[PDB]
Structure formats: C-alpha cells, structure tokens
Symmetry: D4
Subunit: 187 residues, 8 copies
C-alpha cells in the first residue's frame, strides 16, 4: 500500500530563470517550473543546459515538480513524504536546511535537535520521523530480494528463492537473477 | 460502459536509468518514468534509444505510466484491469511472473494453479479472472463489427451491415468497409 | 458559466498507428493517442507526418484527446458536449455517423430523424439538442464587440469604442481593433 | 498557507493561431492554448516563434494556461487570484482593461473608480482588492530573508541569521547568503 | 438515467418560525428548515402543527429541504430541476411567482412571456423549458406501465403486458396488475 | 476492504403513501421515503403502522433508502451491490422481478436465463454475478470464530479460544462466547 | 450566489452533558452534539430540557452543529462565515470572546483593536471583516423589498413594486404584501 | 488543526438486534446501526431500552456510527483514530481485544507486546502509537486554560489570564472562570 510512482522523473533543458526556491528548465519548448533547495539551485547557471531529477506531485487542484541533483536525493525526498504530517513543502524545508548526506546522518544518528532546527517540525514530530526511517536510509542479492517483496511476496519466501538462483549461477546479473528468480517463482 | 481510452500510448527516447521495476525514457527533454516487468526491462540498455508502448493511468492523486514491448501486451494489461479487484500493481505482478504469451495461455487453458502462484491472487480470485476473460484473449470482417460495436450498436445489426458491404465490394479495406457501413446505418 | 478552455489544442507528429477509433501521433518522443471518427482517420496514413486539431478532456480519473481535421469541427465537438446528457463518446458517435457539414445542417434544418439514427440518442434527446443549438452553428466590427461583451462589457459602450477605433483606422485588423478599443475603455 | 506553485511556467514555439482571447503556441508537436489579453495578443504574429510566461491552473475538471509577456505580469496575475471572489476569468478581464503597469498603479494609488470600470467588479469589490494588495506590488538582505520566511522561519530569526551572515561576507550574493544562512540556521 | 429519489419526503411538526422564504417545522425535537414560496408560507401559522411535502437536496457541501403544500407541487418542483440550467433556487423563484396550477398552464399553453417575467430566466431559457416539459405535466392502466418503465423496460413490451393482464382479470388493482405483469416478463 | 456499514437500518412508523416503487413511512415527525419492490410494497397498507428493514446509501449528491420485509432480504440487496456494474437501481430491479427466495436459488442453481430476464443484465453480466456469489448465499462455534477472524485473527488461535470457552460453559450464548473468547486473547 | 440554507435549524431535548465548548441535547432518542460559546453553555443546566437555535455545516468528511441562544445570534454566526478566511471554528472563537451584541457593535463601530484580541485574526484580517459587514448587521417595507432581491430581482425594480402594493393596502401584512407584490411582478 | 467534532454523540432507544459486531438501537422510529466491541455488546439485551455514546464518521461514500458504554471510552476511540495508519476498523479491533481501562494502561505502561497481539498492528506500528499517546490518556485551573487554547490562544496567555481571574474569585467554577477569562481576554 506504499505510494511511489509518478510520471516525470527528470527534466533536461536550458535554464531560463534561477530563483531562490525554484528554477525554470525549458524542455522542448516548455518551461517547466521545478522547486528546489538553494543548495541545489546553487549549482545552476542561467543560459546553461541542465538536468534535475524530479519528483512529480499531482493533487486535485495542483500539479507540481520538485527537483534534485541526483536520484538518491530525489528518492530521499519521497521517503520524507511517507511520514504523515510531513508534506512536500516541509520535506523541501528540511533538505533546504540539511543536504541529503547531512539529513541522512541526522536521521540515522537519531539526532533530534538537528531536526527541530527545521521550521514546522515540533519536538514530538522529530521523534516520529527518526523512528519511521532510521532503518530506511556488486551486492546483487539484497537488490533482487528487495524487489520481489514489491511484487507482493514475503521476505523469507523471497530470500529462499534468491539464494537458490545464485547458488546455481553466481556470476549472474542483478537482472537475469530477477527473471530466473521469478520464472522460478511462478512454479 | 467499458473503460478504455488514455492519452500517452507510447514513449520513445533515450534510456536514462534501468531499474528492477521501471525505466526512465527521456522524450524531448522530459524523463518519463514507466513501470515494467523485469522481462520487459531485460531487453533495455541504458544510453540507448528505446520505445515502450505504454498505458497511462490517472487518478485524483496519481499519474502513472506502464510500459510494454508491444501493443498486444499493453492491451493485455488493460484487459486485466477490467476484472474488479485487479489493480495496476496486481496486473503488473501477474505479467512480471507470466509473460504475455504464457499469461494468455494460462487463462485460455483455464490454468488456475498457475494464477494462484501470483501474490495477491486468491483461489477464488483466480477463478473469477479465468471466467471473465478466457473468451477475451486481412481479417477485415471482425474489426469492422468490433468498431461499430464500440460506437454503441448491436452485434446482429452491425454484423448484417458489415456482411452486406463485404458482399457488394470485394476489393474493400477494413476502413472503407467501416465508412460504407456507417453510411448505411445512418440510413442514408 | 460556459465551459470552454483546455490546454492541448492540436498534435503534430508522425502517425504511428491508425486504428478504427483513434490514431497515435508521435510529437517529440511522445505518442499521443487521439480518438477520431473513421471519416477523420480515413485521411490518415501511417509513416506520414500529420496534424489533428484536438480537444482535451480531463476528469478525476481520465485524461483524453479527441482529434479532428480542422478547428471548425473540433469546435463543433465542444458545442455538442454542452448539451447535458451528451458525453464525449456520444458526441464522437454522432460525428462518426454525420460529418461536421452534414451534422451541422441536420441541426439547423431541425432534422430529428437523422439524429435518432445515432445510437444513444432517443427521440426526446434529439429534440433537446436541436433546440439547444439550432441557433448556435472580413466582418471586423462584430468579432470585436463580441469579445468585449465577452469580457463583461455592454454592447453600447463596446460599439462606441469599436466604431471609434475603426473610424480612425478603417483598415484595422480585428485584433488591433481589440487592443485599441480597450486602451480606450480604461480611459 | 499561500497558494503559489504550478508546473508549466512558460511556452515557447511557433504561433499557430492568434485569436481575440487566446493564442496557440506549438511546443514540440503540441499546440498549447494559452489565454491572454488583447494587449498581449497584440504583439503576436502567426507563423513566428514566440514565448509566453504562463500560469497554469488545474481544477478537478479543468486544466488551463494563462500567458503574459513577462514574469512580472504573470506574477501579478497570480496575486490577483489571491483575493477571494476574484477568479482567473476576472483577473484576466482586469488586465485586459488595464495593462500590468497601469493596473499596478491603479491599486497602489488606491484608485477605485478605475477598478469598477471592470465588469464583475462591484464597488465593495474594488475596495477589498485595493486593501488586500496596495502594499503587495542589488537588494540582497531582503530577498534572502524573504526566502527563509518562506521555508517556514520567522521574520526575527530570518533577519537575525541574515545580518549575521552578511556581516561575515559583505561581498555575498543573494543566494550564497541564503545557503550560509541555512548552514547557520541548522546550528551547522 | 433520470434523477428522482431522495430520503425525506415530508416533515410534520410544530411551526416554530414563519419567514418570507422558509419555515421551521419541529419534528421530534429537531427544527428542520424547509424553504418555500410565500404562497406556501402564507397558509402557515406559528404555534400550529403542520406538514409540508418536501424534496431533499444533498450536494457535497449542502443539505437542503424544499417544502410544498402537496405531492403534485413538490413533484412539479423536481420536474423543473430536470431542465439543465435550472437550479433549486431558480425553480423556487418560478413557483414563488407562479403557483403550481398557474405555472403548469404557463408551460402547457407554451406561454413564454409569463416565464421571462421570472428573474434568471432569459428568452432562450423560457423556450427550452416549455420544450422540455409541455408534454410532461382508477386509471390503473398508465401507472403500471409507468412503473415498469422505470424498472428499465420498454413502452411496447410493458404496454403489451399491462394490456394483456387487464384483459384477463378485470377486477384487478394497479398493483396486482403490476406484480402479475412482472411475473410474466421474468418469463415465469 | 469489503463495504458494509450504514446508519439507518430500519424505519418504523405510519404509512403515509404507498406507490409503485416506494413507500413513505413517517417516523417521529419525518416522512422517510424508502424505495421497495412491488412485492414488498404489496403487503403495505396506508394508515397502518409498519416497519421496513432498510439499507442506506449516501453518495456526494444523494442520500437514499431501500427497504425490505426482513434482514435476510436487505442483506441480499447489499450483496448484489458488491458485484461491480451492479448499482442500487439494478439490484432493486432484480429483486422486483425475483423475490429473495427465488433470486437466491436463481444464483445457487446458476440459472443464467432467469437473470437475463432482468433489464440491464446482459449475458456476460449474468455469468459474472453467478460466479461472484453462488457460494455467497444453534450453530455457535462457527459464528464466533468467524467474527474473530473478522477482527484479523487466525482460525487456529480463534478456535483454541472458542473451544476453550464453550468447553467451559457449553450452554453459552454466541455473544458471551465472543466476549469470553477475547477476554482470553489479550491474555 | 450567497450561501445560506441548511436543514437542522434547532434542537430541543434534554441536556445530557454540558462541556466547555459544546453541549449534548437529546432529541427523540438521539444525542445531538452542538458546539457553543461558554457564554451560551453558561445558561445551560444538565437534566433540564433546552433548545438551541443551530446552524448545520456539512462538508465531504464532516457534519457539525453550532448552537446559539436565539435566531439573531445564529444568523450572525452565518454572516461571519461569509468573510473568506473565516471558518466555523474562527467565527465561534470570536463569539466566544464577544457576545452577539458586543461583537455587533465591534463591527459597526469599526473597532479593530477589539477584533485583533481574537486568536487567528490578524490586523489585516480585522479590517477586511469590518469592511465586509459594517453595513450588514412594524416596518413591513424593508422586509418585503429585502426578500424580492433573493428571488433574483433588482433593488429599484423591487422598491417600485413594493411602494405600489402598500400605496393600495397600507394596513397589509409583511406576508400578504409579499404575495401581492409577486402576483403583481409576474405581470 | 486537530479533528474532533461530529453530530450524533449518542443513541437511546430500544435494542432491536444484538449482533457480534454491532447493535441496532431504535430511536424515534429509526433503527440506527452502531458498531461496537463484543465487550460492549455483551451488556446489551434485545427488547430493552439502552443508550450508547457514539462517534459518527462521515466520508464521501460512508456514514457510520461507533458506540461505547461511556464518554471516556468513546473519546479514547477518537484518540486512537488520530494516529495515522489507524482507521475506525483498526481502532475498534484494539478495543475489542483490550477494554478501555486495559488499553489505556497498555499505552501508558508502553506495553508493546500487548498491542502487537492486535491484528493489523505491526511491531513498528505499536511503537508509533505508544509514542503518539502515552502522554495523552475539582481541577478547574487546567480545564479552563485548556478550553482557551482550543479557542486559539497560547498557553502563556491562557494561563496568565486564568491565574488572574481565579485570583479574583477563588470560589469560581470551571465555566464561570472561562467566561470571565474571555471577558478579560477581550480587553473587556
């Protein structure tokens, strides 16, 4: 029941405008407005071609883009959104204050004081978050087991089947292992 | 009353990212995220130009793409969605487990055991599906009636007319066959 | 309170697929599916570049395109939609049976029998429609005052103005007339 | 709680149609319809490439674009929308009658008679507006603190932090301040 | 597809307040507000027990009652609402001006001038209405077919059957006539 | 995820009006309109006090009551509604044609011809329904474990419990069994 | 386009509970919760029969009652709601602080300081309100002219017709004047 | 921004049906269905007059009642609903398993094992809850200030005002304070 999938996952074009809370990348003829942390905007230079990994949020009366330097960050954004009470604006505020690397450690360390330093986040609030996602921020194995659970399998069920595929083909990809694990799992 | 029509029916561009449950095709300047079965993702190679026949799902708070190698598969996806209780994720799960060819036979054969092996599908569930669509997976003759049918007509009426036109002009194409018929039924 | 304005008013690209009830035009990299009457689809040829004047319909759980050879037809489509009880599909059915020219006369003539010939349209239904829009299917003076009225003005004020501008620059474009008339009405 | 952010902030392409209340710019292959004042449409020439800074409005049953020559104007549009009772059509009507420069002075002067000259705007109406936004139509200190306040801070804290930064780098820019002020504000 | 069915079809209690556009009937302990034409309100007397045949309108953000002296009138109200463009307030305005008997003749006569005299109704408007419902304002025979008709049948089918039953049992009531017919069409 | 619970489950008052498709029961001072099959309406007599077991349906722009002679029938109504494509009106049509007893056998027998005899029900439609609910139309042990499972428990835990309580108080009511079994499962 | 009409306009029963922000009146068997100012609650006494003139607010996910000692107050409540930015809770807060009589003068006097004394109301806010409704807080004439405008007539049009009716029947009611004015206005 | 207020806060009538997951109380002529824990249903006896303190939940497509023996319990129900992820069915499940007294201690003790004993509640889930409301399950000073805070005031102001009042009338009641504190707070 975990909410994850949007449509526009990045925008690449010429920077038309760099503001303090967003940017305007022109892809094709369209100027998309993507909001962003100053940290992100910082690297941007009007007149230059640039790409931002974006997350798209559609609501009944809204259709907005949030951009980031890379996928890891964007993904972090989405994660933040999962905590109830934490909305896009909020999440952006936190990242604006604490870059992805920092914000990640802040949570994993359990560092609450750092979080309260972010407007909108109450003492109680900081805790819930750290709880919700301290343990949420070539391997091959953990990648493929991770995915089989999304297709609605179990942890154990998926780990059995995975060791199995690798037990037979060690030098296999993270993809051909997936298909071999599934072609295996549909009996 | 059958739900069928979307807007983005395909995306062609450069592959920016190949994941385990989706891909990112960059069309124009935009990186569209389309979800896909590993089977589909398998053929894809980052840095290469590629095209996926997609189905688009819009909901109040969501706007998602599902991609597939070809039209037949994508159409199969839509079909699956018709069964109540069966949602996009579910349908993708099934195709992820059983490729289109396989999944098709699984239904036509009536093969229930195969279906239950798909997470989220209960014994009762598998049956309903097989029921709902065992008989749903230059012809010229049947596509024309199929058209008329969706224009909200009836299977004798539009059958008789298609029959009638293919009778009088033999070197006629599925579409000229379609217009000719429509000219008749609007009682010229 | 009359509903009129959408966003995608046309699509130009390569025809990827011509079906019996729609087409797939590829603009940029995107393959847009626009539905269409066989009459319209008829002219289309896969592999060829083509343009369709489209009407866009967005609903909570839907986002669809309807395409047409020209603006006059597309506009007629929208009109049809205005009649309550008449939905996009219905409207398309009617045009599929009666081309724009025909369908227009069918209404203006008041020809009800022709309309009932269209699935979904009952006897009662045909009448309401003919009622609703029998009187609804280089000029210059008329278009401008109409636009102004369209902004909430009063035909007299809007004639005074227009007549003024046109008297001053007889060879005026309809549009310059519009600017030049409003430039007047703020005083 | 102030509503501000959309997605399509401009459209650049070839002008396909210039009407009296809108234009059709073709970006990529798509013809986007953006509504506009005759004043704006005036400068436009079919067959020519053009760009309009747009504001996008999405509602349950609607998805519309409004275009303008530049950012200042488009922003003014959004502002007008903030006044309750004032909708997109209305706001467009006012700008159609009074160009941005004019319309701005009209409000700052407090000139009510001018506003009532716009259909849909009652006497009472004109006042509310002038009220709501008479005081709303290398600087550096201010821009910066404005931003923070937007990130949810308080004018006190935002300023305090800021003098503190610019102290340390009088040389600073409007953004390089912003970050340092955020570094600062994070108790680093 | 015709919209007809609500929940509160009447309110009986003590009149607590008689206004110019509504009344407050207290049923049980609850004071229901039902709106009404002065014509209707006219008969009402505060402190007295009274009953109004009501029509209930629920919308996302609204839950309102409209009351009338009798069923025929209330039903007339609903009818008016069927015409698109005609809302509850409008319909109440018309009845407020023209009592049910009058308003009925106004339509059946086709009398357009009378209708335009009602605020909100334009010349074009009056016509559409007269069109839409000039032919819409122990019978035993027609109520039975009327029933079947709303059960989603057709006017020959249900006509033939009603015909057929009234033929074989003569001392039969509109309802026994209804069941008997339904027993037939479910192909006993 | 199964939709079941409403608020007005019955109405008792004086019959003010008996029509062909509904009745008006006056409870307290309010005249509630409940729709009903002629079969149901048949038994009703204006001027008499009567009670109808009702199902309530609320939608954004609607608030309607459907009434029935007894609980078993009303419940059957709800069931019918579960089949997608089958709306309140439809469901009422079916019951109007086939009384509860009949309509129940029609499904359990699998009798499709009978169902198509009902307007709005297509051949395809009849089948789906029979599929969906052929196996869906003083016990004691069964009702309790079922309720417990109904709260998310596991038949085994819920049998252990029940069996325990019933072994201890054989003459137990189904309900006391329920309390006494849960009083157990918190430990 | 002015929003005014609800359904439950009062509740009369036995007071079951008197709290600090609401009360529970039991009408028939139902305990309705109506929210109220302490000022209002003050007069209330549990175990006693009481009546509160109520305003009902229904929203997609809400159905709430607000009660008041009399109609004038309740009506004032509704008025407050008309100011955008001012919600039920807010309006109640203001009345909780300033009784109807007081709150009325506060607005008519134009007294802004008094309004800012109410939590949630900013300086800017207080002004808008005073603006919006300073001129909004047996005559016979003004009553009946007031009503004809709601039926969608004009001020002048309605005043002409009204003087007319009274010019002919001075000793007429505020009601028989209304019908005589309308029976007159439908020509 | 805390969600609290409904309309039907109790139902009193004759018990028409006692089930395993709900009851049917007939108030006036209406049979209201209120859902309840077996614990609660236990005390109920068909044919008898009874009262349940209820909480009402209205959603776009739903309108449901949940009943409880007393106010403290019903309030506890609402509380549980505040935890995101915890819905009416869930909350009812927990109370069904753990009576109000028990369930209260379970949280205040911080007893997680007990909570996981409730279907739908995961390990992670139990923690969040205990977190969210361990400190949430003639006094006079406090009640009073609580109220004000509810009217939008700030704990500082609310208290300050309050000591100031009770100073002037040590004798005061929880409400007669409230008003005076509001008199006060209005700068009288």
């Amino acid at each position: 029941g975990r909410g994850s999938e949007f449509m526009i996952a990045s925008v690449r074009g010429e920077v038309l405008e760099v503001a303090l809370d967003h940017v305007v990348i022109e892809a094709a003829g369209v100027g998309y407005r993507v909001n962003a942390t100053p940290a992100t905007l910082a690297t941007l230079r009007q007149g230059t071609e640039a790409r931002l990994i974006t997350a798209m949020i559609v609501r009944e009366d809204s259709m907005t883009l949030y951009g980031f330097p890379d996928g890891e960050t964007r993904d972090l954004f989405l994660t933040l959104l999962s905590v109830s009470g934490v909305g896009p604006r909020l999440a952006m505020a936190a990242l604006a204050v604490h870059d992805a690397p920092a914000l990640r450690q802040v949570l994993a360390d359990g560092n609450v004081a750092a979080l309260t330093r972010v407007p909108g986040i109450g003492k109680r609030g900081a805790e819930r978050m750290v709880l919700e996602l301290r343990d949420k921020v070539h391997a091959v194995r953990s990648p493929v087991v991770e995915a089989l659970v999304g297709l609605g399998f179990a942890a154990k069920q998926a780990e059995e089947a995975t060791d199995t595929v690798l037990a037979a083909n060690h030098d296999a990809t993270t993809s051909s292992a997936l298909r071999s694990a599934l072609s295996l799992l549909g009996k």
